[PDB]
C-alpha cells in the first residue's frame, strides 16, 4: 500500500504498487491499481484492492456517461468530486479506500486526493496515501522542482516507492506507473519499469 502522485509542468505522473496482501496470503500481484477513467485521466488507489477496481468501473461508467451526455469530456475536478459524493453516500458499504484521481483537463493538470469518507482537496502539488507513503513522499519532495519533465517524473515516482519497498515487501515488488501527457496515456507494465529500477539496481 502506497500511492504517490506528482503534478509536473508537462503532465501528470502517478505511481502505485501492484502488491497488497490480506494476511500473509497474496490477494494480487498481477492487478493494476491505476486505472484509466476517461481519455487522459487516471485513478490510483491506496487501501484494499477489490473495492478499488469495482469502484473505478462505476466512476469510469459515470465518466463515459458525462462525455456522451453533456457533449464535453469531464474535468478531473468533476470526477474527483463525483467520487467523493459517492463514497460519502456509500458509508454503509465497503468502499473505504483513499484514492487519488488525477489527469489532464481543459484547466491544465491536476490530481485530487479524495478523503475515504468523501471530500476532495485540490492539489497542483504532490500526494501519498498508504503505509509506504511516510518515506516516499520525503524522497519525492527532494528531487521534485516545479520545472520538471515527465521523463524524469517516472524515475522519481519509482524511486519513491523503492523507499517505501525497504519497509516490507508489501509495498513494491511490482510497481505500476502512468504517464499522462494529454496525447499519450501510457501504462508501462512491469517489464519497462523493471529497467527504470535497473538503473537503481533494485
Amino acid at each position: 500500500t502506497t500511492t504517490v502522485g506528482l503534478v509536473c509542468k508537462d503532465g501528470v505522473v502517478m505511481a502505485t504498487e501492484k502488491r497488497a496482501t490480506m494476511g500473509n496470503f497474496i490477494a494480487s500481484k498481477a492487478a493494476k491499481k491505476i486505472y484509466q477513467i476517461a481519455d487522459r485521466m487516471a485513478m490510483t488507489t491506496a487501501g484494499s484492492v477489490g473495492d478499488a477496481q469495482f469502484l473505478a468501473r462505476i466512476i469510469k461508467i459515470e465518466a463515459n456517461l458525462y462525455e456522451i451526455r453533456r457533449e464535453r469530456k469531464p474535468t478531473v475536478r468533476a470526477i474527483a468530486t463525483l467520487t467523493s459524493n459517492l463514497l460519502n453516500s456509500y458509508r454503509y458499504f465497503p468502499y473505504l479506500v483513499q484514492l487519488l484521481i488525477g489527469g489532464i483537463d481543459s484547466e491544465g493538470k491536476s490530481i485530487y486526493s479524495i478523503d475515504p469518507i468523501g471530500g476532495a482537496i485540490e492539489e497542483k502539488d504532490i500526494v501519498a496515501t498508504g503505509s509506504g507513503s511516510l518515506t516516499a513522499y520525503g524522497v519525492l519532495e527532494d528531487r521534485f522542482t516545479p520545472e520538471i519533465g515527465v521523463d524524469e517524473a517516472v524515475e522519481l515516482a519509482v524511486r519513491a516507492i523503492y523507499s517505501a519497498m525497504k519497509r516490507d515487501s508489501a509495498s513494491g515488488d511490482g510497481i505500476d506507473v502512468v504517464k499522462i501527457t494529454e496525447d499519450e496515456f501510457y501504462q508501462y507494465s512491469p517489464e519497462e519499469v523493471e529497467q527504470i529500477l535497473a538503473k537503481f539496481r533494485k
Partner: protein, 235 residues
C-alpha cells in the same frame, strides 16, 4: 388525462402552449458580448407594486431565466431549476452548463406530460447564460429545447420574432443588442416603454456572473430605444 390525438399531438401540450400565449411577453437577445434577457412586468393598475415583481428569476449564479405563461407553474419550475443547478455544484464542483440545466428542467416537464395523474406545466422559460460562450434557450411546455440567438415567448412572440428576422444580426455590440431588445418589447406592447414597467437582467461574458439592471442604468437604454419605437409605430 394526457393522451394522443388522432393527429398524434398531445391535446394537453397544445392547450398548455395557448396557456403560454395568454401569459406576458419576454424576450432575449444575444450577442457575442453577453446575453440580454428582458421580461415585461404586468402593470394593470397603479395598486400593483412594480419594484418587487419577479419576471426575471435568477437560477444559478451565471444563469437567469425569464418566464411567460402561468406564473404559479413557472415559479415552481424555476425553484426546481435552482435546486438542480446547485445539485450540479454539489456532485461535480462546477456550474451547470446553460444547456445542461435546460435539459434537466425539461425532464421535469416531459415526465408530467407523459403521466396521466398530472398535467403539463403551462409555462415556457427562456434560460440564458454564459458557460464559456453566450447561450439562450427557449423551452416549451412539451419539454422541447431550442437554442436561439434571439427569441421571444408570450403574447409578443409573433411580433418580436418577425421583427428579429429583419433587425437581428449575428454579431452585435452589447450596447446595440440591449437597445434592440427594448425596441422589440416596445413594438409588441405597441407603446413607448417606461423604465419601471419592464424588467432587464444580463449575463455578460466579462463578468460570468448574473447581474441585473438597476432602474437608473436601464434609464438611458429606454430613452435611446424610445426614439426607434416611435418610428416603427408610424410605419
Amino acid at each position: 388525462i394526457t393522451v394522443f390525438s388522432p393527429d398524434g399531438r398531445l391535446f394537453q401540450v397544445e392547450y398548455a402552449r395557448e396557456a403560454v400565449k395568454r401569459g406576458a411577453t419576454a424576450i432575449g437577445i444575444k450577442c457575442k458580448e453577453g446575453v440580454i434577457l428582458i421580461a415585461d412586468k404586468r402593470v394593470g393598475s397603479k395598486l400593483l407594486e412594480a419594484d418587487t415583481i419577479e419576471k426575471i428569476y435568477k437560477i444559478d449564479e451565471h444563469i437567469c431565466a425569464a418566464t411567460s405563461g402561468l406564473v404559479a407553474d413557472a415559479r415552481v419550475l424555476i425553484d426546481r431549476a435552482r435546486i438542480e443547478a446547485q445539485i450540479n455544484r454539489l456532485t461535480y464542483d462546477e456550474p451547470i452548463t446553460v444547456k445542461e440545466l435546460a435539459k434537466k428542467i425539461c425532464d421535469f416537464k416531459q415526465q408530467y406530460t407523459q403521466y396521466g395523474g398530472v398535467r403539463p406545466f403551462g409555462v415556457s422559460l427562456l434560460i440564458a447564460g454564459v458557460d464559456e460562450v453566450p447561450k439562450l434557450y427557449e423551452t416549451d411546455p412539451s419539454g422541447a429545447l431550442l437554442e436561439y440567438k434571439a427569441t421571444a415567448i408570450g403574447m409578443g412572440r409573433n411580433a418580436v420574432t418577425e421583427f428579429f428576422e429583419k433587425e437581428y444580426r449575428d454579431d452585435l455590440s452589447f450596447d446595440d443588442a440591449m437597445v434592440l431588445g427594448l425596441v422589440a418589447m416596445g413594438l409588441s406592447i405597441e407603446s413607448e416603454l417606461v423604465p419601471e414597467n419592464i424588467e432587464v437582467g444580463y449575463v455578460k461574458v466579462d463578468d460570468r456572473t448574473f447581474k441585473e439592471v438597476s432602474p437608473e442604468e436601464l434609464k438611458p437604454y429606454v430613452e435611446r430605444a424610445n426614439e426607434r419605437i416611435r418610428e416603427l409605430l408610424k410605419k
